[PDB]
Design a protein around this ligand. Sequence first.
Ligand SMILES: [Cl-]
Ligand SMILES: [Cl-]
Ligand SMILES: [Cl-]
Ligand SMILES: [Cl-]
Ligand SMILES: [Mg+2]
Ligand SMILES: [Mg+2]
Ligand SMILES: [Mg+2]
Ligand SMILES: [Mg+2]
Ligand SMILES: [Mg+2]
Lengths: 356, 356
Amino acid sequence: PCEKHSCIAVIDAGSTGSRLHIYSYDTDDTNTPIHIEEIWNKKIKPGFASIQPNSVTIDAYLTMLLADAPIHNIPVYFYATAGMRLLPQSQQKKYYDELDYWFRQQSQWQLVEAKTITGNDEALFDWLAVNYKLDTLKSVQNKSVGVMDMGGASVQIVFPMPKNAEISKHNQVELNIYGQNINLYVHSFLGLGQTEMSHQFLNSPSCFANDYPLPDGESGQGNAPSCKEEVTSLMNSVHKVNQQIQPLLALNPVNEWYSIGGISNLASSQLFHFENSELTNQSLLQQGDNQICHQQWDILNGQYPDDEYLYQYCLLSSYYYALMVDGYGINPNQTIHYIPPEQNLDWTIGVVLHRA
Amino acid sequence: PCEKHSCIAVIDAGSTGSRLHIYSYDTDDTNTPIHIEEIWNKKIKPGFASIQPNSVTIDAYLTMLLADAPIHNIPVYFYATAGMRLLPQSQQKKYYDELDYWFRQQSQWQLVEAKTITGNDEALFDWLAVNYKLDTLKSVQNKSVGVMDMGGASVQIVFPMPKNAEISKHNQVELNIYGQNINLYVHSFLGLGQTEMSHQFLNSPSCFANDYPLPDGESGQGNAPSCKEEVTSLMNSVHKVNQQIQPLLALNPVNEWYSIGGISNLASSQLFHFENSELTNQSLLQQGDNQICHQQWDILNGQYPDDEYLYQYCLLSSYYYALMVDGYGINPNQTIHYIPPEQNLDWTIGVVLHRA
Ligand SMILES: [Cl-]
Ligand SMILES: [Cl-]
Ligand SMILES: [Cl-]
Ligand SMILES: [Cl-]
Ligand SMILES: [Mg+2]
Ligand SMILES: [Mg+2]
Ligand SMILES: [Mg+2]
Ligand SMILES: [Mg+2]
Ligand SMILES: [Mg+2]
């Protein structure tokens, strides 16, 4: 495989574990990768930012992740995401000093870069991965495509926008893909991913099914519009989502939205009814409110006893609506396409396109 | 030691690790423990809620924590706190089924109870521990004593309040200590502990020193009143702190406040000037704003290069003021006593008093 084509390894060191992807590819006459295929992968737990940063621990982790890979003497990018961004910087440096030493002691792997990427860099890769799979990159479009990543610890949004001198340079990227210049607005909200954000709402009765036992001893008394208003306060007062995103998106409309991350998991539940791997926010909120928020929990749990995430779906439906409608300003009747787990569309494909 | 006196073991299974405390005590003629002394302790990492819940992992963790203890055939309470409260309940059950089996297979340890305690139960123990050490329990007081725990994942507040039929039963406790009936209001806010809450503010420039490098690439531009207003939005809109606490505290005034948890760490920094192991909120906010928020970061870090927490002290000073003044409604000129690490005052003493 790496005899007849180019190969590259990308490690996604995420909040709950690290995922190695090895890709083969060819390069076309615009100096852009084509024919990108995943030829091997490996996942390890727990997250890199949760292990002790010393040589024995890092050696055992990187050995577990890399030792069995079938191929040798290829470039590697090690990119940590939001879990590492949460750590103080002085603590991050301990990991990277150990990791840099480990890669210098061997030869199977040619380390190009090991770093914590910003959420803006992650948003760029998210947009390239989705558009590669949609086959919208090889041609000038005349339809704006926007991507949202609904991640566990951060969320990303990215969409085409001409260069704007009045906007931070860190929220704008310029790249040329398949011969065409592209300008994207990028943004990430650290802490607004579903797992991290959930930690603020666990004792909010509006966000759980009726009679769900909250950790403080109180009972759920669900109401999606109430839970949404709570979540919208965190989004707009702390993260300033609407103030930053909504005016820009209004002037740079997106014709199609695609979302990666947690929405398919929710949308695929037997409790929801969505078709065409898409949803509208109005439908999402109505179905969460009727089927989970105002539902008696014991009866619901009895009908779906093995779905370990079902209890969060009043909060999650409210939260997705708060982010997309109240934060980004998307119309509640706009279609959002979501991409399933069972597509194995991974943001690391964007690293291949931009950096290989 | 356990030959001449009673003994009891309390395990604090907290967010970042578990701490075993073995106490000796005697019992007075009111059936209340006296002479409570810690005769052994043991700390292990990481947090119980972060390890895999299977028999090999739990056996290795509990062995590491308990095997070396000097004494045998004593009652044990295993109490997990906010880190376990964050986990879904179905996941918590896996831990407790393994733990219950492990204790049934041996005899050094007589397990009384293993559970996740609510933040309300934790607040009760916090108040008893502080008042035991202040020697205010053995006598009827005529001065109301309030306690705040500024924890890593939740915060607690507790103060005397007569029984009120209009208030949740879960936020009120009744107990008799040294022959005297006590009625306390208790409350906990899960997610508002300093570590968990910080995860929402890391890209907020008002909360960091000038030019501090935020994870998204932007620079700190500190301003304590701005960072405080951000934190107050999360406290009052999501957690509803002021709506719940402020009216009750206004009608049930506290004459002395004591705080356990993170404030001593901050207040003890060479950058702050506090005397008498106490502070006022007005002074805390002014000193954070002048010494950290509006301070040039590179120069500050150069003068205090080994203080790994200093970078957070604009956020932390703002956050403590937001919680105490904007959330609980405490006057900015009111003295708050804080108890240092170097007192080893631990909330588990409250378990001895209430349950031994
Ligand atoms: Cl709680
Ligand atoms: Cl419905
Ligand atoms: Cl970021
Ligand atoms: Cl000052
Ligand atoms: Mg090439
Ligand atoms: Mg190029
Ligand atoms: Mg965490
Ligand atoms: Mg007794
Ligand atoms: Mg008694």
